Amino acid sequence: MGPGFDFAQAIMKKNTVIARTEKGEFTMLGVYDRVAVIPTHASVGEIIYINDVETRVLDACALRDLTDTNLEITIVKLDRNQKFRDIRHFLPRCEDDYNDAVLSVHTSKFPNMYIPVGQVTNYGFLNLGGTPTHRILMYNFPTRAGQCGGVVTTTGKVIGIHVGGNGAQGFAAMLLHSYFTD
Fold first, then answer.
1. How far is CA 25 from CA 15, 131, 148, in A?
2. Which one of 7, 79, 110, 149 has the lowest number of neighbouring Cβ atoms within 10 Å?
3. Interior CA angle at 44 toward 47 and 78, to 5°?
4. In the annotation, is 94 catalytic?
5. Active-site annotation holder among 106, 134, 148, 162
């Protein structure tokens, strides 16, 4: 509809895949080369389906902060025959708040879904399904079941992936440039 949805659509069209684990289907953001991210509760194993293709997992790392607290981001390296467009220059360097964000989802259940979620708070600590979690972003949209992995963007920035909600609010794990230095 406008420049927020334009930037969101540009990321979805080139930098997402449908990830299937034994825990269900997730939006999965490709970041560079064969490296992608998914919520840690997807429980990535040795084999994953990527757009319904059986794919060996070369590495999978559940991120935690230096306090040894869950970040709810798993960085996955895929045995895929094709690289992602490198979008690391769209990642923020620091924890921050944002205006006018879009949550974008692409699954079997929710194809080509874009949600204007409005203002994003640097919320920090969240007890997420019983697990203490840091670097949480919050938006006042009633997200449901089927949004996990969904990409949170502003114009110019990819800021997080959707990991949960309480029925009134949705919560995203921050993406930071420092997660993907090589």
1. 16, 22, 9
2. 79
3. 55
4. no
5. 148
